[PDB]
Amino acid sequence: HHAAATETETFAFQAEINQLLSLIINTFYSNKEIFLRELISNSSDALDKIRFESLTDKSKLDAQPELFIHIIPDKATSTLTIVDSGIGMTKSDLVNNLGTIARSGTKEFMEALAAGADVSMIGQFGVGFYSAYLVAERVVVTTKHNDDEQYVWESQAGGSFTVTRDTSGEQLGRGTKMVLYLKDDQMEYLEERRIKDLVKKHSEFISYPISLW
Amino acid sequence: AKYRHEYYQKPEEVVVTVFAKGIPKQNVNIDFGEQILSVVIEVPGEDAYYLQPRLFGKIIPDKCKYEVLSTKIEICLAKADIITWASLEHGK
Amino acid sequence: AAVIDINQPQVCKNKGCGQTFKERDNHETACSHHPGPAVFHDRLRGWKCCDVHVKEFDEFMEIPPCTKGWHSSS
Ligand SMILES: Nc1ncnc2c1ncn2[C@@H]1O[C@H](COP(=O)(O)OP(=O)(O)O)[C@@H](O)[C@H]1O
Ligand SMILES: [Mg+2]
Ligand SMILES: [Zn+2]
Ligand SMILES: [Zn+2]
């Protein structure tokens, strides 16, 4: 019993995810805007999960009774933030799902890209999250699952990521927040109209209210 | 595990034998379902033996029987269908 | 398992069933249910057992049980 083991843990990405990241970051794509659709999809999926769980246990929603997605651009910090009240992720979920396990679609998506497939397919190959690196140089994810405490995952896609217990941040209640630190030439995603048109273009018929702030 | 059991079969019935030696008939509770056998044997000094497999085939409870003998218990299961069971228990 | 009473009513916990059953009456095709799991992925809602995936959550709720098996008290 070590009664203080809540530090900061550092993890290496799986080789195939390092490769995926390098492919995403070092090649030119004319449709980088698809990143927003991918993040909205992940939020929608997470909202579905807690919704489903709640059908057999109404107390599942207690920490946040509303199901929503909030998008918050900030010109002062150059960040685009996306918040949802989905099922959120356990500390284990973070490590397992966001870096440390190469899912089967990863190597498959890389081959599909080399053969001629468009990066827009990334969602179908089980790796849509990493598309955030199309426009961001750094991503921090804070997340809160009913079963666990609030944690923060962070990476600049340099071969590693960290996971840190978040005792001081805002405090989500339940769900996840992704903060994207946009690269210099990607500031267009902070404009209200760009976001509005984009949400309308690729999302539009999602089953949960999206608001812009 | 307290007693072992064996079976043999005929086109229309499966005969299960439980090798339990000097058991008084009143201590033997056996019941039959559509596709399950229930055998519960009380042992005053110890925990009760039970054998309650889901069966490989369907049976006809009303036509099933058993006899408690000096040396063993013989149970006759009436098959619902004329087929050779590959085992006694379902999925085995 | 522990000992059971084949005459005792139970609630089946298989998805899409929830019926009360006895077990003396149970059998290999008694219960119609989705073995599951439910799948919520890339904006589609569905069931991995029958591989039907639908689009609307409410629609997903109407996808009929796909499998006949044993009722299960757990
Ligand atoms: N907003 C979110 N809320 C909860 N979990 C998430 C969120 N975004 C991503 N995840 C987790 O990360 C995993 C990987 O996401 P992604 O790379 O888009 O692949 P996929 O959605 O195909 O599984 C998801 O399966 C999910 O478990
Ligand atoms: Mg995805
Ligand atoms: Zn199904
Ligand atoms: Zn059932």
UniProtKB/TrEMBL annotation, chain A:
Residues holding Mg(2+): 42
Superkingdom of the source species: Eukaryota
Localization annotation: Cytoplasm
Residues engaged in binding ADP 1: 42, 84, 97, 129
Binding sites annotated in the UniProt record for ATP: 38, 42, 84, 89, 97, 104-105, 124-129, 176
Every Histidine kinase/HSP90-like ATPase domain range: 31-186
Residues annotated as binding ADP 2: 42, 84, 97, 129, 176
Signal peptide location: none
Function (record text): Molecular chaperone that promotes the maturation, structural maintenance and proper regulation of specific target proteins involved for instance in cell cycle control and signal transduction. Undergoes a functional cycle that is linked to its ATPase activity. This cycle probably induces conformational changes in the client proteins, thereby causing their activation. Interacts dynamically with various co-chaperones that modulate its substrate recognition, ATPase cycle and chaperone function.
Family: Belongs to the heat shock protein 90 family.
The protein's name: Cytosolic heat shock protein 90
Provenance organism: Hordeum vulgare
